[PDB]
Motif scaffolding. Structure first.
Motif, PDB file in Angstrom:
ATOM      1  N   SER A   1       0.842  -1.248   0.000  1.00  0.00           N
ATOM      2  CA  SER A   1       0.000   0.000   0.000  1.00  0.00           C
ATOM      3  C   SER A   1       0.871   1.291   0.000  1.00  0.00           C
ATOM      4  CB  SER A   1      -1.005  -0.030   1.180  1.00  0.00           C
ATOM      5  OG  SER A   1      -1.872  -1.173   1.134  1.00  0.00           O
ATOM      6  N   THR A   2       0.358   2.353  -0.647  1.00  0.00           N
ATOM      7  CA  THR A   2       1.185   3.379  -1.324  1.00  0.00           C
ATOM      8  C   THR A   2       1.515   4.691  -0.582  1.00  0.00           C
ATOM      9  OG1 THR A   2      -0.898   3.771  -2.629  1.00  0.00           O
ATOM     10  CG2 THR A   2       0.846   2.670  -3.757  1.00  0.00           C
ATOM     11  N   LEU A   3       2.015   5.655  -1.360  1.00  0.00           N
ATOM     12  CA  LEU A   3       2.237   7.045  -0.952  1.00  0.00           C
ATOM     13  C   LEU A   3       0.971   7.678  -0.384  1.00  0.00           C
ATOM     14  CD1 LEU A   3       4.222   9.549  -1.248  1.00  0.00           C
ATOM     15  CD2 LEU A   3       3.003   9.985  -3.409  1.00  0.00           C
ATOM     16  N   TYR A   4      -0.118   7.545  -1.146  1.00  0.00           N
ATOM     17  CA  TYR A   4      -1.464   7.966  -0.737  1.00  0.00           C
ATOM     18  C   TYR A   4      -1.758   7.602   0.747  1.00  0.00           C
ATOM     19  CZ  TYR A   4      -6.664   8.021  -0.657  1.00  0.00           C
ATOM     20  OH  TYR A   4      -7.989   8.208  -0.319  1.00  0.00           O
ATOM     21  N   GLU A   5      -1.218   6.467   1.206  1.00  0.00           N
ATOM     22  CA  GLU A   5      -1.352   6.025   2.599  1.00  0.00           C
ATOM     23  C   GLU A   5      -0.432   6.808   3.568  1.00  0.00           C
ATOM     24  OE1 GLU A   5      -1.261   1.716   3.770  1.00  0.00           O
ATOM     25  OE2 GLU A   5       0.890   2.035   4.201  1.00  0.00           O
ATOM     26  N   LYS A   6       0.874   6.864   3.270  1.00  0.00           N
ATOM     27  CA  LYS A   6       1.929   7.385   4.190  1.00  0.00           C
ATOM     28  C   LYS A   6       1.977   8.921   4.488  1.00  0.00           C
ATOM     29  CE  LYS A   6       4.788   3.685   1.998  1.00  0.00           C
ATOM     30  NZ  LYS A   6       4.426   3.058   0.658  1.00  0.00           N
ATOM     31  N   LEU A   7       1.519   9.732   3.536  1.00  0.00           N
ATOM     32  CA  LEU A   7       1.396  11.191   3.711  1.00  0.00           C
ATOM     33  C   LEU A   7      -0.017  11.625   4.120  1.00  0.00           C
ATOM     34  CD1 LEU A   7       3.285  12.891   0.684  1.00  0.00           C
ATOM     35  CD2 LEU A   7       3.900  13.130   3.126  1.00  0.00           C
ATOM     36  N   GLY A   8      -1.012  10.775   3.906  1.00  0.00           N
ATOM     37  CA  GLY A   8      -2.359  11.070   4.344  1.00  0.00           C
ATOM     38  C   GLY A   8      -3.401  11.546   3.334  1.00  0.00           C
ATOM     39  N   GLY A   9      -3.446  10.991   2.138  1.00  0.00           N
ATOM     40  CA  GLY A   9      -4.577  11.258   1.251  1.00  0.00           C
ATOM     41  C   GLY A   9      -4.216  12.225   0.130  1.00  0.00           C
ATOM     42  N   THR A  10      -5.200  12.519  -0.717  1.00  0.00           N
ATOM     43  CA  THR A  10      -5.020  13.228  -1.988  1.00  0.00           C
ATOM     44  C   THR A  10      -4.411  14.610  -1.807  1.00  0.00           C
ATOM     45  OG1 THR A  10      -7.042  12.060  -2.678  1.00  0.00           O
ATOM     46  CG2 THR A  10      -6.316  13.717  -4.173  1.00  0.00           C
ATOM     47  N   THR A  11      -4.934  15.339  -0.836  1.00  0.00           N
ATOM     48  CA  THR A  11      -4.558  16.724  -0.632  1.00  0.00           C
ATOM     49  C   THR A  11      -3.122  16.801  -0.115  1.00  0.00           C
ATOM     50  OG1 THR A  11      -6.766  17.642  -0.400  1.00  0.00           O
ATOM     51  CG2 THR A  11      -5.085  18.784   0.750  1.00  0.00           C
ATOM     52  N   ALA A  12      -2.779  15.950   0.851  1.00  0.00           N
ATOM     53  CA  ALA A  12      -1.417  15.886   1.342  1.00  0.00           C
ATOM     54  C   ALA A  12      -0.453  15.562   0.223  1.00  0.00           C
ATOM     55  CB  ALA A  12      -1.276  14.844   2.491  1.00  0.00           C
ATOM     56  N   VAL A  13      -0.797  14.583  -0.618  1.00  0.00           N
ATOM     57  CA  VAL A  13       0.076  14.131  -1.722  1.00  0.00           C
ATOM     58  C   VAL A  13       0.199  15.268  -2.724  1.00  0.00           C
ATOM     59  CG1 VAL A  13       0.251  12.526  -3.697  1.00  0.00           C
ATOM     60  CG2 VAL A  13      -0.528  11.662  -1.483  1.00  0.00           C
ATOM     61  N   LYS A  47       6.315  13.612  -9.185  1.00  0.00           N
ATOM     62  CA  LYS A  47       5.415  12.660  -8.534  1.00  0.00           C
ATOM     63  C   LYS A  47       5.977  11.242  -8.501  1.00  0.00           C
ATOM     64  CE  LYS A  47       0.738  10.825  -8.337  1.00  0.00           C
ATOM     65  NZ  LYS A  47      -0.617  10.901  -8.932  1.00  0.00           N
ATOM     66  N   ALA A  48       6.571  10.807  -9.591  1.00  0.00           N
ATOM     67  CA  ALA A  48       7.292   9.539  -9.631  1.00  0.00           C
ATOM     68  C   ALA A  48       8.454   9.449  -8.663  1.00  0.00           C
ATOM     69  CB  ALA A  48       7.800   9.274 -11.067  1.00  0.00           C
ATOM     70  N   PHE A  49       9.345  10.437  -8.683  1.00  0.00           N
ATOM     71  CA  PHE A  49      10.498  10.447  -7.776  1.00  0.00           C
ATOM     72  C   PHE A  49      10.028  10.375  -6.306  1.00  0.00           C
ATOM     73  CE2 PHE A  49      13.827  12.171  -5.095  1.00  0.00           C
ATOM     74  CZ  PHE A  49      15.011  11.615  -5.600  1.00  0.00           C
ATOM     75  N   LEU A  50       9.044  11.220  -5.974  1.00  0.00           N
ATOM     76  CA  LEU A  50       8.502  11.298  -4.643  1.00  0.00           C
ATOM     77  C   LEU A  50       7.937   9.932  -4.266  1.00  0.00           C
ATOM     78  CD1 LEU A  50       6.897  14.294  -2.983  1.00  0.00           C
ATOM     79  CD2 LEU A  50       5.659  12.169  -2.941  1.00  0.00           C
ATOM     80  N   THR A  51       7.238   9.298  -5.209  1.00  0.00           N
ATOM     81  CA  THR A  51       6.604   8.003  -4.969  1.00  0.00           C
ATOM     82  C   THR A  51       7.679   6.974  -4.702  1.00  0.00           C
ATOM     83  OG1 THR A  51       4.665   8.531  -6.361  1.00  0.00           O
ATOM     84  CG2 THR A  51       4.940   6.276  -5.825  1.00  0.00           C
ATOM     85  N   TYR A  52       8.743   7.005  -5.496  1.00  0.00           N
ATOM     86  CA  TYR A  52       9.886   6.142  -5.291  1.00  0.00           C
ATOM     87  C   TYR A  52      10.487   6.327  -3.891  1.00  0.00           C
ATOM     88  CZ  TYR A  52      14.785   4.946  -5.250  1.00  0.00           C
ATOM     89  OH  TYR A  52      16.027   4.524  -4.813  1.00  0.00           O
ATOM     90  N   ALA A  53      10.683   7.574  -3.491  1.00  0.00           N
ATOM     91  CA  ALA A  53      11.403   7.921  -2.281  1.00  0.00           C
ATOM     92  C   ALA A  53      10.622   7.598  -0.996  1.00  0.00           C
ATOM     93  CB  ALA A  53      11.854   9.403  -2.296  1.00  0.00           C
ATOM     94  N   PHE A  54       9.303   7.490  -1.095  1.00  0.00           N
ATOM     95  CA  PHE A  54       8.457   7.130   0.037  1.00  0.00           C
ATOM     96  C   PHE A  54       8.257   5.611   0.155  1.00  0.00           C
ATOM     97  CE2 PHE A  54       7.501  11.553   0.549  1.00  0.00           C
ATOM     98  CZ  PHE A  54       7.162  11.651   1.890  1.00  0.00           C
TER      99      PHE A  54
END
Ligand code: HEM
Length: 123
Positions: A1-13, A47-54
């Motif tokens: 389960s993803t970035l969307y989970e670890k930062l807290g939803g659409t707005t945070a991302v 967005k890709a880099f950030l997704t990778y890094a999380f």
């Protein structure tokens, strides 16, 4: 389960990605690598880099990373200094946004992880 989970939803991302995009856009060390890329695609890269890094390394196979950046390495002079500026820009973004320093340190460790860096850099 993803970035969307670890930062807290659409707005945070969205905040994370927009701020990271904005910083990279204004960063003279690295902007010329995106010279041939429109704003939507540059944003998608951050967005890709950030997704990778999380911790979603999951969908950035090193072989894809090597081919995807080969022309940057050969023709734009992409090297470690540039790679490090991207990671630095992300961490600076997260810190402006109050992300806990413990969490920034965890993403610092993925962003700067050696094997994916060597693939990107075609080393
Ligand atoms: C682990 C770090 C990085 C990852 C995970 C990564 C990921 C990606 C991916 C997935 C693409 C392909 C997009 C596509 O096929 O549409 C790409 C393209 C690109 N990357 Fe990276 N990248 C990384 C680091 C870098 C660095 C350090 C630079 C330059 C300073 C950079 C510059 C670009 C450029 C110029 C493109 C081509 C244009 C674009 O599709 O946005 N990337 N990157």
């Amino acid at each position: 389960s993803t970035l969307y989970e670890k930062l807290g939803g659409t707005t945070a991302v969205d905040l994370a990605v927009d701020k990271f995009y904005e910083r990279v856009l204004q960063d003279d060390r690295i902007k010329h690598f995106f010279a041939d890329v429109d704003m939507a695609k540059q944003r998608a890269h951050q967005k890709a880099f950030l997704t990778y890094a999380f911790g979603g390394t999951d969908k950035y196979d090193g072989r894809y990373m090597r081919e995807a950046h080969k022309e940057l390495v050969e023709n734009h002079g992409l090297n470690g200094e540039h790679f490090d500026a991207v990671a630095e820009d992300l961490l600076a973004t997260l810190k402006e946004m109050g992300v806990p320093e413990d969490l920034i340190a965890e993403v610092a460790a993925v962003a700067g992880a050696p094997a994916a860096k060597r693939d990107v850099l075609n080393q």
